[PDB]
Every structure is written in structure tokens, then in C-alpha cells.
Amino acid sequence: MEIVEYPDPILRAKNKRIDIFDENLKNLVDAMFDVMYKTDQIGLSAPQVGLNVQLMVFNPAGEPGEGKEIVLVNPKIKKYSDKLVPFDEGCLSFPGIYAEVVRPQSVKIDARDITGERFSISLSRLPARIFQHEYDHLEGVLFFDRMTDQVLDSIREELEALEKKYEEKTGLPSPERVEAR
Template sequence: MFDVMYKTDGIGLSAPQVGVNVQLMVFNPAGVKGEGEEIVLVNPVVYKMSKRLLVYEESCLSFPGIYANVVRPDNVKIDAQDVTGAKIKFKLSGLSARVFQHEFDHLQGILFFDRMSLDVLESVREGLKVCKNVIIVQNNEIASKFYLIAVVNARTV
């Protein structure tokens, strides 16, 4: 998964994005192989989020070319397992917390469009129409197209 992430200039990737239905994510906020820390989390659970919310521009490897502001908690505390099954606890803040939350959302079936305000979503709607025909990961082709059609055609609160 790290290879796919680095080849697509990403800093995080969840297993469902590559067609694997497991609760697993990888990320490296440095975004460069051999730099920063490569983190693998299995079965992550968030048990605390900060009340402080920050706006930050995000993008998603599943929807190339779409960049939009998303509001998220500044830090999170999580439980997870490493690849050996050992239990681990983390407190993540800043960019690491942001990347974790983005990938965690994928594991929950939530995409960053779901976190956008209506104004922000409207600002990326044309890009989403173009993105309907762009697929990064072959296994996600049908699901991505149907989801994008739904997002482009209607979003009500």
C-alpha cells in the first residue's frame, strides 16, 4: 500500500481505496519514501477528539485534482493494532491527525465530500463531474463512479 501511496503522491491510503475490505490504513505525513515515519494501523478506534477545530485544504487519491477545505479536530487519541496484532495507543496532532482522520473516514465509508460545507462542495462540483471519468484504483471503479454521480447530482442537508 505504501508503494501505491507514494506512486500517486499521497501521504495516506486506506485499504478500501485499493479494493481490500479490511480496517487498515497506512500513512506518512512526509509523503516521501525513506523520509518521515511510515505508520500502519489495523482496526483503529478513535476514543477522544479535541474540541479545537481547524480548517485545512485536503485532497484524496480516489478523486484526483479535487482540493477543498475541510474542518476537523486538531488532535485525536486512538487505539489500534500494529501489523503483528499488538495493541498500540497514539495521540496524533497537526498533519498526522488530519491524515489519520481522512483515512479513518474511508474505513467508515465516509469521504471528504461528506465533511465539506455546502458552499465548499458547490465550489468543487465541476471538478467532481470531470473526476467521474478518472479512476486511480481499478477495483474501486464502479463504486467511485456511482458515489460521484450521487454527490454531483444531489446533496441535501
């Protein structure tokens, strides 16, 4: 298993809905969770680990045996709150890169469980924050897309280094460039 980093093209690709809720969705949830736990994370999307589909493992507690293990197959945020707030956000795709981002405080979500049953849920504080961050992933959106132009200008060299890293490691031109912004 591996975490895909920017600027890898799977992180921006279209993520396919899931339909076969079977032994293999489960296995995949399991292994996505353990990655989430191995990287001290509170949530983690399928594109991040190389697969381009509509899947999220989550636990608000962000900790082994604390909170609840929730899976969100095909999530869709049905409500974002008017109040929004700052936070020094980070991402497993941009290691070491942290900058400020504004996202709505609380969110209303629908999704399907590991059995494919349809539930709802609301969140606030850090869990709605980590949930929005992983939700953008499912949508080919990376958190700097959500940064003002001054905040982004602050991490610009750290992104170009990643870009450069992907070019060196794959022999291909970077699929996208933060200069484009």
C-alpha cells in the same frame, strides 16, 4: 495495483475487520506503503486500493526514509480534540479536486499492529489531518461529505464529471450522485 476513484462503490462499502495477521497482511502492507510512497502520500487506506477492509498504512513524514512506518489494523479514534481547523484538503480518489474542510486539530487512536498487538497514539498538525482523512475512508466517508454546502457547491461540477466518468467506463449508473446532497 490501482487507486479506486469516486464514485466507485468499494470507497463507500463496509470494510471488514481483519483477524489473520500472517505473511499476507504484511505483503499487503508493504505494497500499500510503496503505493503511498509512489503517490507521495502520508497515509492510505485499503478501500483506496480496491480492498474493503480495516487497514491503514501511515508515515507522518510522508517521505522515503523519514518518520516511522506505522500500520493501523482496525483503527478506532478514541478522542477528537475540541479545537478544529480549516485546510485545503485533497484526495487520491478525486484527482485535481481540492477544497476547504474543518476537522479537529489533534486525535487519540487505538489500533493493532502488523502482529495484531494493540497500541495507542496521538497526533496533531498535518499527520492527524491525513489520518482523519484516511480514517473516513475505512468508514465509507469521502471528504466532500465533510464540506459545508458552499464549499461543496464549488466542487459540484468536478464530482459530476467523475460520476460521468464511472458511467462511461463501467456502463452502469453512478452508484451515488452529488445532486443527492
